[PDB]
Amino acid sequence: MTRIISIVSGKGGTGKTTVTANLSVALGEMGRKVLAVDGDLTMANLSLVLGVDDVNITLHDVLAGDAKLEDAIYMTQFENVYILPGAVDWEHVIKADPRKLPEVIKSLKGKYDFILIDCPAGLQLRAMSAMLSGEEAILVTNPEISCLTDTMKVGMVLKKAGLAILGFILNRYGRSERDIPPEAAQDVMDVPLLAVIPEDPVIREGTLEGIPAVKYKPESKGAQAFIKLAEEVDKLAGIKAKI
């Protein structure tokens, strides 16, 4: 039962790409075959944070009808993690039909244990097309009320569209003393808190190095938090196996 999970939020800069990157790597380490998909058509960032530098053909070419989907799937430096990357040049950006995202992504069912979709924030055409490509969703938020509500709003929309909202992640926690604590955040949100990920410079270093915190610095608290989240998310694979 390949789980297609959209990583979404109400605002930008909340950690959608970071979550997609670390969760993909962690699950890959747990023995799961993972495809991380860059659903952010205008700001393709996934390949960079995953340090994938051998990219030519992209998701954008598939969406433009110019390439086969199987020719846009790359092996990454991370165990059991594959990437369906986005192009960064504007010419590819405009020719990519967003509307074809759900059919492209879903035609991959049966080939991975997880397909994680890094989505752009908001509710415009690009964002909806990406988010609606998944069948489950994880809401990423920061500890500020406006972010929480705007995100729960996105969550309701996806809920009405037929997706199972697994829960939310309280990211960037401990960044400010005005940060809403977990419990209060859990009260505001109507879905389970899946994890509290602290504001952690190690996570930022990972982003910059093209190596997610999880594998970059395995003992850090940033990594440990993402590993715990991966353990949790990984519940529809049963075997909890690599053996």
Ligand X SMILES: Nc1ncnc2c1ncn2[C@@H]1O[C@H](COP(=O)(O)OP(=O)(O)O)[C@@H](O)[C@H]1O
User: Does residue 197 touch ligand X according to CB under 6 A?
Assistant: yes
CA distance 225 to 169: 11
- In single-letter form, the type of residue at position 38 comes to D
- The pattern of x and - marking residues 28 through 57 that bind ligand X according to CB under 6 A reads -----------------x------------
Q: Which of 37, 50, 107, 55 is nearest to 79 (CA)?
A: 50
Instruction: Please tell me whether 65 is known to bind a ligand.
Output: no
Distance between terminal CA atoms of the chain?
A: 18
* Letter string b/e over residues 24-45, b meaning 16 or more CB atoms within 10 A of that residue's CB: bbbbbbbbbebbbbbbbbebbb
- The pattern of x and - marking residues 27 through 56 that bind Mg ion according to CB under 5 A reads ------------------x-----------
Is 8 strand, coil or helix?
Answer: strand
Instruction: Please tell me whether 134 is known to bind a ligand.
Output: no
CA distance 213 to 221: 9
CA distance 198 to 142: 10
User: Does residue 15 touch ligand X according to CB under 6 A?
Assistant: yes
CA distance 126 to 143: 26
Name the binder of 171 from Mg ion, ligand X, none, CB < 5-8 A by kind: ligand X
Q: Which of 203, 223, 229, 233 binds ligand X (CB under 6 A)?
A: 203
From the list 51-59, 62-70, 156-164, 193-201, the region that binds ligand X by CB under 6 A is: 193-201
User: Does residue 17 touch Mg ion according to CB under 5 A?
Assistant: yes
CA distance 148 to 143: 7
Q: Which of 200, 211, 223, 229 binds ligand X (CB under 6 A)?
A: 200
Name the binder of 234 from ligand X, Mg ion, none, CB < 5-8 A by kind: none
Residues in contact with Mg ion by CB under 5 A are 16-17, 45
Residues in contact with ligand X by CB under 6 A are 9, 12-18, 45, 171-172, 197-200, 203-204, 207
Can you say which residues are annotated as belonging to the binding site for Mg(2+)? 17
Can you say which residues are annotated as belonging to the binding site for ADP? 13-18, 171, 198-200, 207
